[PDB]
Amino acid sequence: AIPSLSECQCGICMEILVEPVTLPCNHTLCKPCFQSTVEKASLCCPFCRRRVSSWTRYHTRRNSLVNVELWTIIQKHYPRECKLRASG
Amino acid sequence: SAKAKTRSSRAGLQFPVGRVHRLLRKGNYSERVGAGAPVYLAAVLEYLTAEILELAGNAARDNKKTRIIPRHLQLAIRNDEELNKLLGRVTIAQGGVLPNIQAVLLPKKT
Amino acid sequence: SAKAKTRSSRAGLQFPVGRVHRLLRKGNYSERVGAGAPVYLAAVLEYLTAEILELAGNAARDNKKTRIIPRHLQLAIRNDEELNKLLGRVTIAQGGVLPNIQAVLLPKK
Amino acid sequence: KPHRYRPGTVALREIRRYQKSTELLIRKLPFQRLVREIAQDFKTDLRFQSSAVMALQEACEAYLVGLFEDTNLCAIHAKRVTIMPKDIQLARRIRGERA
Amino acid sequence: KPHRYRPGTVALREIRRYQKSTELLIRKLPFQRLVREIAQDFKTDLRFQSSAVMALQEACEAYLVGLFEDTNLCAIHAKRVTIMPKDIQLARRIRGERA
Amino acid sequence: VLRDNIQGITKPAIRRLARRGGVKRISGLIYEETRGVLKVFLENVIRDAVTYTEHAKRKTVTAMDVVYALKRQGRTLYGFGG
């Protein structure tokens, strides 16, 4: 099963996990929220305050930041939310 | 930041900023040292030290030791893809090497 | 030698000593530049230039050309030993390379 | 009747002819186009001084010539006379470029 | 009855045992004597700080270990598993040390 | 925009660069590989050249920029400035 549309949101901006990223601390947030919480914050987890600097480098080096399989579940279970989120 | 506290705090860093300012002045790097450069350089230094110390701490936790020793630093530096390229020529004292055996030398599956 | 004359001629050199003094002062190499350092440095630079020009002039005379070109500088630098150890990494533009065919590749009866 | 040299002599003759000269070997305009392409990749809307393109060409040629010298040394070391990609890879791995 | 491993296994076991550690391998006093000998050759009547001898030993060991890594790469490249002096000479010639 | 220009480094040009290096016999899998490594080298020099040009707030890459990039990498070049 999958958590409802409520928990499918980003735990920061309360919006859908558009292109989510799964941090080493098991947390998740949408790609814009991620890139903000890394390029304008202290490179730490917004949930449990865990630095992911090295992991961030190691994975963006391979462009393996986005979690593809969760994103596929979101696009097959709640596609219209992702599409209405796609414009803005 | 209106805070008239030590410039380290006013920049949010941990590395000293006045000391970096002096080292940039007395070091004959240039005639004038702008007031922004020491803060920037202290931030960069702190960030690099944070990276290396985090990786070394991870390695030391892996080897079940609660105190980083040069071997863990060598492991952390050589296992990362960028910290190795930045320190390609450096030689860590008491660092050992990365454990790896060439594939051709391993015994014949018989 | 006491004199009131251009520091170059007084030192018995050809390179400028005033220009080297200025470059040592306005280059942020140190705070103060001793009065005897620019002379030493101009002398060393002149010696090295004379060395390379000796070898290059020889190499140019070999090719029957009476005017040094980069090829001759490259030959004179690679053929020598100390100079090639000093300029190991340097690349001389338009310099070609030493003629060197490995022995194994040569024909055989 | 058609007089043709044995395979292995025109190669040595070309080695001599090219080591005895200095001009550029990679043609100018294709190398210039390659450089401009990599440039527009890095920072768009650039211009180049012809001297800079020439310096790039000289550096690239000297680097490739050194790499081929060391590659040939490897290929001879392995009791061969042909250079193969593993030779170049070994040369670059030993030289300390990529590791 | 005398149980002896086939030739080629104690070697790998030693490789693992020595890559898994960090201590110095060249014994201390002979290396110190060698360093003092080269010193008295260069400028006579010298003294050495123990830290300087240790730094020399660390640098020498790291250099030799790197050289043996590249030598082993060469020897494997030539379809062998033994390192021979031509391997070391090729490693140093390619690396750019002596030319 | 430009694309597929590494093929401008043709096969005979690499053959020439190989002869000057002293190579008697080349294998057909070298050419491709060569292009590869050459590209890498360029992507390591131009990147620094641009970095200099972007610092001085210019839009042309002067020869001194390339020379400084090379010298910074360790491939000092004589003949254009420095």
Place this chain on the structure above:
Amino acid sequence: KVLRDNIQGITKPAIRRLARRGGVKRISGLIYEETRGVLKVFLENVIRDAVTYTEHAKRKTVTAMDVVYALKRQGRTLYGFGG
């Protein structure tokens, strides 16, 4: 206090250990001598610089910083002893 043939202090087992750490499985009997040669050369390019610093500062003890500077000059920066 002269000395002789101290490079034979770099014995054959020590070179075998150095080669094991480098990942070498089988060593030819003609490596040892060769290695010693190489080793000596390396030292005669570091000590010569180290002493050159000591001669300059008008000292008679080659300090750790001298050796570290001599190394850094050759492109073999060494961490752990200073600077």
Place this chain on the structure above:
Amino acid sequence: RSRKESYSIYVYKVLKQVHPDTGISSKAMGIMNSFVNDIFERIAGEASRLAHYNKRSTITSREIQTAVRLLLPGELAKHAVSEGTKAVTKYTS
């Protein structure tokens, strides 16, 4: 006696910031001192050569930024540039 300067206390602060339990040996502290001094020398030297090439006479922030873009490899470069820009922006205001 004489007092020496080192980055020991600051390295220890950063450690206790990113790993609240693991200490650090003395020799590792020496290695970190040497590493910080080395990176300092590299960055400052490259910024000085930039100032000298562009005929400026002062090492502003942007010279340090370009030096960091030059020395550090790609991803470290981006991260450190962002971090330094953030620190300066916070220090100013």
Place this chain on the structure above:
Amino acid sequence: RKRSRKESYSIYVYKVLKQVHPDTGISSKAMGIMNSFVNDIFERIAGEASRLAHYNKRSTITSREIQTAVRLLLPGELAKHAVSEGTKAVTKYTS
């Protein structure tokens, strides 16, 4: 307007040439190469003397600093001959 002036070691290299080979000219590209070589060697020696005077907490680049930088920077015979030439020139200048 008027073009700004660019210094170079052209005339000095030409003087040294006419001392060594009194009949052999030199072409412009060779002149640029020799000029860049002089600049590079000057930079190496000066920077080495700078680091050397900074190691011992001195503030002055004396002649001894250049002498030791030369001893550190050049191969054997070149180091010996260049140190000889430098000492000769300095003592002739001061006397």
Place this chain on the structure above:
Amino acid sequence: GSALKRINKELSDLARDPPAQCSAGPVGDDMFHWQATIMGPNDSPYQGGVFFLTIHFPTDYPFKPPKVAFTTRIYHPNINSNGSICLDILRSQWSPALTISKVLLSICSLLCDPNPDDPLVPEIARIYKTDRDKYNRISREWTQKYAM
């Protein structure tokens, strides 16, 4: 574009969940300019007092912290003349996942015990850490004559 939804979530939070011994709201129609009211905690030398404070949400909220400052004049070791506050999760420790309620509870905890480590006004900090009786005397007098 996300700041509007973030402030919407925050106002809905303060609606459905009032902060502990506190309240807040938009002082004007604009969402980025807010006013809040804090009640004096018992374990704080400012018992019974009520203080109004102004909130300025930044442009890159939440990833940038919103500047809060006490408008009422308070003689506090962490409150300067105009009423600015020194809080680490307000300058650098600010995690954008935090809501209003968490920063309000943190400033409450600071009101419970002033932090003169990096103080704004030195003499009030030194009289708080030197002689506490005169300190809580003057703070109680302030929170009775200005907060009442």
Place this chain on the structure above:
DNA sequence: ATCGAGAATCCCGGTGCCGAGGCCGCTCAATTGGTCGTAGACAGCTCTAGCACCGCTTAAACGCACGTACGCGCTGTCCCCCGCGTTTTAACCGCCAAGGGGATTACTCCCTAGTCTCCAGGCACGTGTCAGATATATACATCCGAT
């Protein structure tokens, strides 16, 4: 071994052009002279660390035997680079044109060096305690001969 045809390469002489070397005018930086603060040389004192020596333990070096894996040479195969002739694509060159942006000059102001005063951040030093090294005794994994 040899010798002769076939391409290839080295010498040599006539012609031509553009650039290397030299001349001239003029700006600006190198030189001279004087003054002045201080970096550095030098004497003196201290006391840290390097050198030399000795005696004991035991780990490592060593010399040797021996079996064997592999380094090296030979043979044979086949396939894939080389040389070459032919055709087709595009580099190169000489020319012209537009304009953009690098380089230069003038002005203004604010950012940093320099100075003085003041005080707490950090450093040398001293002290306690637990992380890790050590020793011991196990279980466990892996190698190897023989089925």
Place this chain on the structure above:
DNA sequence: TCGGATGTATATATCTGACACGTGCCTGGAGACTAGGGAGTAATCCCCTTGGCGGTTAAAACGCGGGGGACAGCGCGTACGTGCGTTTAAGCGGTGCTAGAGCTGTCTACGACCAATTGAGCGGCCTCGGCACCGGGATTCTCGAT
């Protein structure tokens, strides 16, 4: 496949010295103020970079025949790994001596700084010779054929 045999990882007491923390102070960092020149902004100007023909022709692309080198397979005889008994000297601890690194104080000769001033060096012009180039001729490797 297979049971001995050996090296390795693992769990447990223990003990010691390296690390983390508290302290006095003191020297270097922070704060206020002043001046001046370095850098930024504006304007302009002309050097040279991009873009574009169009013709020639050197050079790349393609295909083909074959021969020589890459590579696999066998073999064989030595060089080298493994194990062991023996001899050597490294390592350690403890001690004694002092050479020399390091620090402080004093004093002056050396280098910075500044105003003047005058010639070396740089920009621009230019002209004759060194080198490029072409054409022919001399010769010299190369290959096959005996």
